[PDB]
Amino acid sequence: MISGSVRFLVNLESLNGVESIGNLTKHRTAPVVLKTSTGYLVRYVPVISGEALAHAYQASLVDIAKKEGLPVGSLSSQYEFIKFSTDEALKIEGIKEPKDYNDARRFEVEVMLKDVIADVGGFMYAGGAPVRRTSRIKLGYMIPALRGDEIPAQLEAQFHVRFSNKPVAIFNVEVSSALYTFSFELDEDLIAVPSTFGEKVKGEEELERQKAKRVKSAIKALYSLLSGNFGGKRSRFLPSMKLMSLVVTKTDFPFMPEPAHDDDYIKTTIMRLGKAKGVLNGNLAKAYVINNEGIEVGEGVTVLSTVEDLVVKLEE
Amino acid sequence: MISGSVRFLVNLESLNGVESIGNLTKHRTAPVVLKTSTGYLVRYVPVISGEALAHAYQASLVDIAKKEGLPVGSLSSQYEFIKFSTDEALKIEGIKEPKDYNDARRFEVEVMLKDVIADVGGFMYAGGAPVRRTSRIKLGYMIPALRGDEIPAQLEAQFHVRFSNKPVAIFNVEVSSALYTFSFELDEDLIAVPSTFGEKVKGEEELERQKAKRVKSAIKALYSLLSGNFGGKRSRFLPSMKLMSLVVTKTDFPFMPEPAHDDDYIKTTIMRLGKAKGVLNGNLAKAYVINNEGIEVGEGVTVLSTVEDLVVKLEE
Amino acid sequence: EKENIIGRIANLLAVGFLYSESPTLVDRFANALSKEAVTKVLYDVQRIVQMGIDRSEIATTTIKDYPAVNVNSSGAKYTVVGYLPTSQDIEDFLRMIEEDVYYARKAGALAMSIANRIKLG
Amino acid sequence: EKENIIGRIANLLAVGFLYSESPTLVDRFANALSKEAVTKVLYDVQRIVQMGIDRSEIATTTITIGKDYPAVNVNSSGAKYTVVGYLPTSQDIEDFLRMIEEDVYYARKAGALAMSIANRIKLGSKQSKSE
Amino acid sequence: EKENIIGRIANLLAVGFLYSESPTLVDRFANALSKEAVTKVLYDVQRIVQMGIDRSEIATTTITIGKDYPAVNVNSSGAKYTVVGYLPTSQDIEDFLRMIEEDVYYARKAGALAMSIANRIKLGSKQSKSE
Amino acid sequence: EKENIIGRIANLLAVGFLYSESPTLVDRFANALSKEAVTKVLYDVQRIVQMGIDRSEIATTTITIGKDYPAVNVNSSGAKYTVVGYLPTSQDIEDFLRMIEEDVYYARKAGALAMSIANRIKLGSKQSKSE
Amino acid sequence: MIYSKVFLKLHWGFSVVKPLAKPGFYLPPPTTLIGALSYGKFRGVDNINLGNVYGSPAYNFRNIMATARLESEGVYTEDTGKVYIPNGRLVVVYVTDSISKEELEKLCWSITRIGCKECLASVENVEVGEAKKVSGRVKTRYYFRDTVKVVGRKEFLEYVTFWEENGYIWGKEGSPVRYILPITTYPLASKEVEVEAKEAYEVGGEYVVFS
């Protein structure tokens, strides 16, 4: 697996919105329970849903897959990720629905040969014979650091007007600033592998012939999320991002490093990995760290200068 | 026995989506009465049942057992813990159904040898010769800490849309936050031990040979639960958990620390442990504590750092 | 009077729905599990009604004569029979919600019934 | 005398509500859990009333309801309202703030009275326009 | 002693407001988010009070409200006002600035008290002119 | 020790102000944006104090406030003032100028303290004359 | 006759589903109490030969009297009837004349669940003593039989049904017996009631009625 936690610093931003009221466009918000020196407070904070990040990642994957030469679906080539949920998607793609349980496996192979996206990100098909497939990449909301008792985050409104010569045209937009964080997981030992139990079916050999390329492309697709390309309203509110701290872990056993809420989440996660290797009878474990805010790390770790080097070494 | 009480802090999740109405997926909630000077107030609070935790624990146990080498059933190799409940499972596995009461022990030994999960997990077989085996691990619902005159648990709704190029698409998801607490029990003194009265039957020697490995695996399986690898909707709603307080007691007799609701439960459970040992002529009684919220502890306790050391000491 | 308060809240929700042509506030009100969700809808629906009042698209009238509210939306004319809630009705309704959020579901069901009958006619 | 003070505070809140056409200050007053929230509303409502006085849209008068009663005339958005009673004195504000420092319940009582005054006046004004 | 310091700062702000007839310094004080804004107002209000002292339009006095209480008489634009209490000492300003360096909340508390003092005095002065 | 230096500079400014009856040097000190303006005031105030010393109108003394405290007596225009504390040493002036070369804020702090000392003394002197 | 009192600290609440839609019970039945008592001695066996059939490892204690009451307010939910009462407190009284005081005292420290697996419950303290039998008018909170007469106002009498010990064996249904509970329907609570008990034991300040 490959797990990670990352910390961003965002200013004058509007990357997610929800239903509007009047001439006001809203920024997404959610509750959070923060433990302060006095007790357990409840606060409201701007959050960015994980599906925006998922959409950005899948779009980048589609681009790379098309550029390299791997198969890509019909609809997904236009950046519409309905995958194969409803019957119309099948009809456009030109595939037959499954008949009964015993045939289900065959379905999953065909859909998994026509579209790399349905492979990496999974899919569902409601109907007589459901065919589930859990995603191979997992993501969660982007909450600002809950360090201390003063959450660094602010949300304000701004006033804009549309010029005209014959008045007969005023709107308000919510803009934010914060120190965001998020964590991600991606298990690369289940890519290009059928996830339904049954007898062997033809074409699995072709699946196995491309495994290296599919895995390499899936790894490269993370450069998008790690560089700062996602969200919306980027035409006129281009945000000013910057990377501060990042921890990535490559292992052979289940693992989940520390959420980046505390100033010391690198040393703790490194020690936890060191002990987990022994306790779980693991064989491989490596930790990469990008540090820009000059916080304590520890000893015996690899320090990378940029994300390009991290992606290169992950691929190698 | 190994009993424990732990106190969690989860920020943003949907880990148990009971029911679904319209275009909305609903969380699970329970009523709680909060006492006030004016009177009483009924509030609704999120809760995660224990069945999901049991499923996660058994999945981890299967994954570990298949890696060590102990037997694992056929249907249980696929993550479908039906267990030998009806004739179909027996026919698939190939085990002769028990003839009458006298053969109950033989069938129990056979099943216990054929599948680890039926040993630790337990099973019930319906028929003219019913057989039973209570689970050797017990878990309870997860409820937030009813401390003071506030309930630090919020539960909002969120709006999401599926994009399309030919509009003709909307869903809502309930997202919660709270300070969760839960307690668990695990009696390792009954693992790999038949659970019926009668003359011994061939095969118990293999059970005695494998007892050590089975117990070690059962203890290793709790690392996943204590690490936060349960629930659903983990793909697009990856939560952010953290550990605050933990009390783990190992003894030679029934015992269960205080629920982690009050802000001081470590001291109370230590005192009750002393009294229980005094009254029950106990021989072994040890307690380990992890304290990150700076609450009162007392004296006569071992202070660890993380769950890895706790599991190592439990193994030793 | 609890039923009179609930009926006046249902009239407010029905006026807001007919004027906005959106069920979203009534859906939020009928699905509320907290005082926060109910209070947020009570503000947002009154804010919609305030815009209709300022535009003279929402007005009180009589239609024996019964009190009514005329609503003009997208060239459609609707008439809701009854009074809008007072500030005291909102405060007493919020106290009822602090005891039992069921009253929000009851008001939402009544509001949708009023709006459906008017839209059918 | 406590009820007279509460009644005069309720008249001030009702005049401010009818003049501003906004319930927001009365909502804040009736939901107050601290002396800070109450005192902030007492300033903001008097600041609204001060603007109405300077514009000559708020004036003290007497009305025959056969004896003359003290009243306050309010003109807002071409509507005319008349609140019967006195506005609070500086001493009434100070004694009311002392009552709030003992029990914030008195802010809820004044808010409930103010909303009742405003609702009755708004209902009567709408009925006369419909006739 | 913290409440006494806040009360003396509130008296200074109320005297400066009544003398200048401007709420601007009290608005700046109650909206302060930094020690800079608070300290700037503490200088500017004392500079206004210094001019009133030099003109003999601001003077300390005692008033019987049957014991004598310390007070400050303020003459502005032919209006006479009397604020009951002491003005802050240099030590009160320094201790108040230390309280602000810990929590800017105390500037809001002093501003709310100052506006309450000024409003009560202005209301009483307008009522006596109407009679 | 930084606060003691600032307090001794504030005493010098207050003595110079009370003796000259002019706020001009304290105004210049509290508004300084450069080391030049601060140093010029430190010279000019000490030059005023030097004249008061030569005339025997400024003298060091002790006063019982039951222990003896160091003080400076100032006679100006037939008024008698007493400032409690020490005047700065040459080392205090030099260390204060080094503090100003790091941050001119310390001139504003000393000016605010000096004006507080002078105001309290002037208020007390006017009250005793009125009695 | 000897008696014991226990102070149980529930974790989140118990659960018992009625026999023969899965509604639950307001308070634990007597059979569950007897079984929870017996658990301490039979920790590790789920089947004992009764000589004709395997019914349960708890048929031994089928001649012990027990009752229980709540010390807080609880909420009954149907979402599988449950009685949520997190962090509450349950008071159970055992009246017995079979085993010695030490046996009952040690057993009373060996309870860790009432109902199903999830119904974890800690034990806070226990008391042991003797009981005096009387037949005069008394005031009680622990539930009693349906056959018991009532003298006070009929206000909080809830009629439920329970099963005799015969239900300890599988493939069989225990006989139905009516029972009366002095409880408030919503919210759940415990209230005292006067009764003209024919056989009531004083157990240290509280009167318990059995017939």
Swiss-Prot record, chains A, B:
InterPro entries: Cas7/Cst2/DevR_sub_I-a/Apern, CRISPR-assoc_Cas7/Cst2/DevR, CRISPR-Cas7/Cst2/DevR
GO molecular function: RNA binding
Assigned keywords, A-Z: Antiviral defense, RNA-binding
Known partners and oligomeric status: Part of the aCascade ribonucleoprotein complex, minimally composed of Csa2 and Cas5a, which binds crRNA. Other possible components of aCascade in strain P1 are Cas6b (SSO1437) and Csa5 (SSO1443), while SSO1399, Cas5b (SSO1400) and SSO1401 have sometimes been seen weakly associated. Csa2 is probably the major RNA-binding subunit. The Csa2-Cas5a-crRNA complex also binds target DNA homologous to crRNA, probably forming an R-loop. Purified aCascade forms a filament about 6 nm in width.
Family that this chain belongs to: Belongs to the CRISPR-associated protein Cas7/Cst2/DevR family. Subtype I-a/Apern subfamily.
Note: Crystallography and cloning were done with strain P2, while interaction experiments were done with genes cloned from strain P2 but over-expressed in P1. The aCascade complex was purified from strain P1.
Protein name as catalogued: CRISPR-associated aCascade subunit Cas7/Csa2 2
Organism: Saccharolobus solfataricus (strain ATCC 35092 / DSM 1617 / JCM 11322 / P2) (Sulfolobus solfataricus)
High-level lineage: Archaea, Thermoproteota, Thermoprotei, Sulfolobales, Sulfolobaceae
UniProtKB/Swiss-Prot annotation, chains D, E, F:
Additional record remark: The aCascade complex was purified from strain P1.
Sorted UniProt keywords: Antiviral defense, Toxin
InterPro entries linked: CRISPR-assoc_Cas5
Organism (species): Saccharolobus solfataricus (strain ATCC 35092 / DSM 1617 / JCM 11322 / P2) (Sulfolobus solfataricus)
Binding partners and assembly: Probably oligomeric upon overexpression; does not interact with a Cas5 (Sso1441)/Cas7 (Sso1442)/crRNA complex. Forms dimer and tetramer-sized oligomers when overexpressed in the absence of CRISPR loci A-D; the oligomers are probably responsible for its toxicity in the absence of CRISPR loci A-D. Part of the aCascade ribonucleoprotein complex, minimally composed of Cas7 (formerly Csa2) and Cas5a, which binds crRNA. Other possible components of aCascade in strain P1 are Cas6b (SSO1437) and Csa5 (SSO1443), while SSO1399, Cas5b (SSO1400) and SSO1401 have sometimes been seen weakly associated.
Function, as annotated: CRISPR (clustered regularly interspaced short palindromic repeat) is an adaptive immune system that provides protection against mobile genetic elements (viruses, transposable elements and conjugative plasmids). CRISPR clusters contain spacers, sequences complementary to antecedent mobile elements, and target invading nucleic acids. CRISPR clusters are transcribed and processed into CRISPR RNA (crRNA).
Protein name: CRISPR type I-A cluster 2/Apern-associated protein Csa5-2
GO BP, one annotated term: defense response to virus
Gene Ontology terms for molecular function: toxin activity
From Swiss-Prot, chain G:
Keyword RNA-binding carried by entry: yes
Disulfide linkage: none
Family annotation (CDD domains): Cas5_I-A
A GO term, aspect molecular function: RNA binding
Lineage: superkingdom: Archaea
UniProt KW keywords: Antiviral defense, RNA-binding
UniProt keyword annotation of Secreted present: no
Function: CRISPR (clustered regularly interspaced short palindromic repeat) is an adaptive immune system that provides protection against mobile genetic elements (viruses, transposable elements and conjugative plasmids). CRISPR clusters contain spacers, sequences complementary to antecedent mobile elements, and target invading nucleic acids. CRISPR clusters are transcribed and processed into CRISPR RNA (crRNA).
Subunit relationships: Part of the aCascade ribonucleoprotein complex, minimally composed of Csa2 and Cas5a, which binds crRNA. Other possible components of aCascade in strain P1 are Cas6b (SSO1437) and Csa5 (SSO1443), while SSO1399, Cas5b (SSO1400) and SSO1401 have sometimes been seen weakly associated. Csa2 is probably the major RNA-binding subunit. The Csa2-Cas5a-crRNA complex also binds target DNA homologous to crRNA, probably forming an R-loop. Purified aCascade forms a filament about 6 nm in width.
Annotated protein name in UniProt: CRISPR system aCascade subunit Cas5 1
